Design a protein around this ligand. Structure first.
Ligand SMILES: Nc1nc(=O)c2ncn([C@@H]3O[C@@H]4COP(=O)(O)O[C@H]5[C@@H](O)[C@H](n6cnc7c(N)ncnc76)O[C@@H]5COP(=O)(O)O[C@@H]3[C@@H]4O)c2[nH]1
Ligand SMILES: Nc1nc(=O)c2ncn([C@@H]3O[C@@H]4COP(=O)(O)O[C@H]5[C@@H](O)[C@H](n6cnc7c(N)ncnc76)O[C@@H]5COP(=O)(O)O[C@@H]3[C@@H]4O)c2[nH]1
Length: 409
C-alpha cells in the first residue's frame, strides 16, 4: 500500500524533521551566553565585531547556497544547514576568542540562508495535487518547532534552573540528532532550476514573464518594501538581544526571558500571519497606508527599545519586540501574496531571491556604516535610535507616497 505508506513513513517523517530541525533551545540564549560569565565578551565587542559578521557573511553565502539548493536537489543543503548549526554550537561551547565567534556567525549565516531550502524542498518533492496539504502540515510543524524551541529553552533556564553552558549542550544534542534525521530525507525527483523535467526556454520565458510582471503596481510597492523594511527588521532582530543585555544585565541566568520573547513572538507571529489572510486580498488598494501604518508602529517600537534604561522596565522591551516582530509578520503574508500573485514558481523563487539579495545588500550597507567598528562602531542604544529614524524615514515615504497616490487628481 504505497498510498498509506507515503503518508505515514514519508509525510509523517517530513513533518517530524521540520519539527526537529527547528528546535535549538539555546538559540535565543546566544547573546546572553556570549555576554555572560561563561565566554566573557564585552558588550561593545559583540555589537561591533561579532554581529556585523552575521550581516556580511549572509551577503556572501546567499547566492551560493540558493544555487546549491536547487543543484543538489535540496537534501544536502538541509544537511549543510544541520551541520552548520552543529558547527555554530561547537564554536559557542569551545571557541573563546573574538575571532572564533566571527566564524560562528559565518556558520550561522549559512543556516540563515539555507532555511528556505526546506520550504522549497516540499514543492519539488510532493505531487502538485497533494502539495497544499503536505506544505500545510509542514509549515505547521516548523511553526510548532520554533515555538517549542523557545519554550523548552525558557523552561530549562527559568523553571529547570539549567545554566547557559548546560543548555547549549542540550541544544547540541537536538542538533546532532537533526543531522541524523536530515540524512534519511528522500531526495526529490526534480528540482526547480537545475534538475527540471521535460528539458520557450527556462531563461527566455522567465525574463519575458518578469518584464510583464515588473510593471504591476502591487509588485513594485511590495518588492520595495521587501528590500528596505525587511532589512531594517533584521537589523533589529540581530541587535535586540544585545540591547536586552544592556537594559538588564544579570549573569543570573534564570531571569533572562529571551525564550519567552521568542516564543510569544512566534505565537503572535502566527496570529498576525493568520489574520493577514483576510487582509491579503481585502486591503490591496489601501496598500501604502497599510505599510506606512505598520512601519510607523515599527518606528515607535524600535524607539521604545532605545528609550528604556531601567532594569525594572525590561518587560516593556520584551513587549516592544514581540509587538515589533508580530507587526512585521502581519505584512509578510500580504507581501508574499501581492508579489507572488501572477508569478510562476520559477519566477517566484527568483523575485523573492532578488528581494532577499537586495535586502541583504542594503543591510550590509547599514551594518558597515552604523554598526561595524570600521564604519562608526556605535553602541546598541545609539544604534536603535538610527533604526528608529530609518523606520520613520521609511514610514514617511510610503505615507507621502500615499498622499501622492490617494489624493492624485
Ligand atoms: N504567513 C506567512 N506567509 C509567508 O509567505 C511568509 N514568509 C515569511 N514569513 C515570516 O515572516 C518572517 C520573514 O523572514 P524571511 O521570509 O525573510 O526568512 C524566511 C524565509 O527565507 C524562509 N521561508 C519561509 N517560508 C518560505 C517559503 N514558502 N518559501 C521559501 N522560503 C521560505 O524561511 C525564513 C523564516 O520563515 P518563517 O520562520 O516560517 O516566518 C517568516 C519570518 O518570521 C511568512 N509568513
Ligand atoms: N503561515 C505561513 N508561513 C509561511 O512561511 C508560508 N509560506 C507560504 N505560505 C502559504 O502556504 C501556501 C504555500 O505556497 P508556497 O509557499 O509553496 O508559495 C509561496 C512561497 O514559495 C513564496 N514565498 C513566500 N514567502 C517567502 C519567503 N520568506 N521567502 C522566499 N519565498 C517566499 O511566495 C509564495 C506565495 O505564498 P502565499 O500566497 O503568501 O501563502 C502561501 C501559500 O498559500 C505560508 N504560510
Amino acid at each position: 500500500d504505497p498510498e498509506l505508506r507515503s503518508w505515514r513513513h514519508l509525510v509523517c517523517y517530513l513533518c517530524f524533521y521540520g519539527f526537529m530541525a527547528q528546535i535549538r533551545p539555546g538559540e535565543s540564549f546566544i547573546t546572553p551566553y556570549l555576554l555572560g560569565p561563561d565566554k566573557n565578551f564585552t558588550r561593545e565587542q559583540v555589537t561591533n565585531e561579532i554581529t556585523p559578521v552575521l550581516s556580511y557573511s549572509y551577503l556572501a553565502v546567499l547566492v551560493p547556497v540558493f544555487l546549491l539548493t536547487d543543484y543538489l536537489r535540496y537534501t544536502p543543503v538541509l544537511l549543510l544547514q544541520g551541520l552548520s548549526f552543529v558547527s555554530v554550537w561547537l564554536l559557542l561551547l569551545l571557541g573563546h576568542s573574538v575571532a572564533h565567534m566571527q566564524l560562528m556567525e559565518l556558520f550561522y549565516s549559512v543556516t540563515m540562508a539555507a532555511r528556505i531550502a526546506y520550504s522549497s524542498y516540499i514543492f519539488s518533492l510532493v505531487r502538485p495535487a497533494r502539495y497544499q496539504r503536505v506544505a500545510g502540515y509542514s509549515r505547521a510543524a516548523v511553526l510548532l518547532g520554533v515555538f517549542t524551541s523557545s519554550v523548552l529553552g525558557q523552561l530549562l533556564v527559568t523553571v529547570g534552573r539549567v545554566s547557559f553552558s548546560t543548555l547549549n549542550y542540550i541544544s547540541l544534542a537536538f542538533l546532532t540528532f537533526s543531522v541524523v534525521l536530515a540524512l534519511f530525507l528522500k531526495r526529490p525527483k526534480r528540482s526547480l532550476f537545475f534538475n527540471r523535467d521535460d528539458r520557450d526556454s527556462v531563461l527566455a520565458r522567465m525574463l519575458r514573464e518578469l518584464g510583464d510582471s515588473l510593471r504591476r503596481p502591487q509588485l513594485r510597492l511590495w518588492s520595495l518594501w521587501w528590500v528596505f523594511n525587511s532589512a531594517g527588521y533584521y537589523l533589529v532582530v540581530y541587535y535586540v538581544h544585545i540591547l536586552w543585555n544592556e537594559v538588564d544585565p544579570t549573569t543570573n541566568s534564570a531571569r533572562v526571558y529571551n525564550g519567552a520573547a521568542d516564543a510569544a513572538s512566534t505565537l503572535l507571529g502566527a496570529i498576525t500571519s493568520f489574520a493577514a489572510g483576510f487582509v491579503k486580498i481585502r486591503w490591496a488598494r489601501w496598500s501604502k497606508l497599510l505599510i506606512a501604518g505598520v512601519t510607523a508602529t515599527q518606528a515607535g517600537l524600535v524607539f521604545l527599545l532605545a528609550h528604556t534604561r531601567h532594569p525594572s522596565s525590561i518587560w516593556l522591551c520584551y513587549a516592544a519586540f514581540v509587538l515589533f516582530r508580530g507587526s512585521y509578520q502581519f505584512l509578510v503574508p500580504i507581501a508574499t501574496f501581492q508579489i507572488a500573485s501572477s508569478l510562476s514558481k520559477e519566477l517566484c523563487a527568483l523575485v523573492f531571491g532578488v528581494n532577499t539579495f537586495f535586502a541583504t545588500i542594503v543591510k550590509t550597507i547599514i551594518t558597515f556604516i552604523v554598526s561595524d567598528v570600521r564604519g562608526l562602531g556605535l553602541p546598541v542604544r545609539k544604534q536603535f535610535q538610527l533604526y528608529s529614524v530609518y523606520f520613520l524615514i521609511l514610514s514617511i515615504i510610503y505615507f507621502l507616497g500615499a498622499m501622492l497616490d490617494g489624493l492624485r487628481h
